[PDB]
Design a protein around this ligand. Structure first.
Ligand SMILES: Cc1cn([C@H]2C[C@H](O)[C@@H](COP(=O)(O)NP(=O)(O)OP(=O)(O)O)O2)c(=O)[nH]c1=O
Ligand SMILES: [Mn+2]
Ligand SMILES: [Mn+2]
Ligand code: NA
Ligand code: NA
Length: 327
DNA sequence: CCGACGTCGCATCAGC
DNA sequence: GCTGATGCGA
DNA sequence: GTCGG
């Protein structure tokens, strides 16, 4: 499948998906449209009719009809209409600010606040997260070249070890799968002193060090186990400076760590296949653990895990490199 | 016909 | 002031 | 909106 092979259809479906989530607040319709757009994006033929498309899992009657209208006319009356709707288009747009969801966007537009400019005029109505999202609106929509990610990893691994050399840190997500660009940086953190059985400054101390060396620039949220924030590489001499980036750091017990690494490495569809299969061998994998069923379905206690590959053993599959986990 | 469909940590709100 | 609900991101 | 018990 190439980009423009069914691009107009998947663009249409994705656009419909966003208005469902952001304006209609119909979240299951949101996933319905995305699932349709995903299965169509994978389909290796230029679609000729809605009936043709309806054969794919997740494409039903209503989308089949919409595809017919699109193929025949090059557009969709309902989408064109909501595109001109000042209220609805504004609500959908404002949700592009991290921290502004469907609800907040709704209330902003209710009281006349419709644009980024409007948001800038109204700081006192923004919470902390929303202000950061506004401040880095442009930066947050850019992707991160692997080269910068590697440099980001350099700093994170270095500063983590410097705080305590017994920390274990892993940059997972699309980076660990070897993607040539990434949307954010997903850092997983553990330490021998932290198990399920059992201080919680363990995460605080890492964040503070990365702040001290001015890598982490802002904080969206921060608890005892999960940090969400903003970071930036140092500017290489008198050159154009780097965009601010999203970084997550989360602290995981040692005995749950590699289940965590596996999950937060992904990808999405790989994770389900691997969750999905492995059902058919009587195990339940979650973000934290693998547990055995269970002759009529009662999960017993979590099994020991000390490597990624461990999990693969349990469910009888060859350890697969992160590089081949897109599906 | 009709309910499932993605869950969970953190920030902030709503109610007492 | 405390407890639970809601919004949010991913 | 789609699927399926
Ligand atoms: C959000 C999400 C994440 N994950 C796992 C797989 C993701 O690859 C991994 C990290 O989530 P991500 O950062 O939201 N996606 P990504 O890192 O693969 O891609 P990107 O570069 O951030 O765009 O965690 C899921 O399995 N289901 C999810 O719904
Ligand atoms: Mn990521
Ligand atoms: Mn992420
Ligand atoms: Na179908
Ligand atoms: Na948003």
């Amino acid at each position: 499948p190439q980009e423009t092979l069914n691009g107009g259809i998947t663009d249409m479906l994705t656009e419909l998906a966003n208005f469902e989530k952001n304006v209609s607040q119909a979240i299951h319709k949101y996933n319905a449209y995305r699932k349709a757009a995903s299965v169509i994006a994978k389909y290796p033929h230029k679609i000729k009719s809605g009936a043709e498309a309806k054969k794919l899992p997740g494409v039903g009657t209503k989308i089949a009809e919409k595809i017919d209208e699109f193929l025949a006319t090059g557009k969709l009356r309902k989408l064109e209409k909501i595109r001109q709707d000042d209220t609805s288009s504004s609500i959908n747009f404002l949700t592009r600010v991290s921290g502004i969801g469907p609800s907040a966007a709704r209330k902003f537009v209710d009281e006349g606040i419709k644009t980024l400019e409007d948001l800038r005029k109204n700081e006192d109505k923004l919470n902390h997260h929303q202000r950061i999202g506004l401040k880095y609106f442009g930066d947050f929509e850019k992707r991160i070249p692997r080269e910068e990610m590697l440099q980001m990893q350099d700093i994170v691994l270095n500063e983590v070890k410097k705080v305590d050399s017994e920390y274990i840190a892993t940059v997972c997500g699309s980076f660990r799968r070897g993607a040539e660009s990434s949307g954010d940086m997903d850092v997983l953190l553990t330490h021998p002193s932290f198990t399920s059985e059992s201080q919680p400054k363990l995460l605080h101390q890492v964040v503070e060090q990365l702040q001290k060396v001015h890598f982490i620039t802002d904080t969206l949220s921060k608890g005892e186990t999960k940090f969400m924030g903003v970071c930036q590489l140092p500017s290489k001499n008198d050159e154009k400076e780097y965009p601010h980036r999203r970084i997550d750091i989360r602290l995981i017990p040692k005995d749950q760590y590699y289940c965590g690494v596996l999950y937060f490495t992904g990808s999405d569809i790989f994770n389900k296949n691997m969750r999905a299969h492995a059902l058919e061998k009587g195990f339940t994998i979650n973000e934290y653990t693998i547990r055995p069923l269970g002759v009529t379905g009662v999960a017993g206690e979590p099994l020991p895990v000390d490597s990624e590959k461990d999990i693969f053993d349990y469910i009888q599959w060859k350890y697969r490199e992160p590089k081949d986990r897109s599906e």
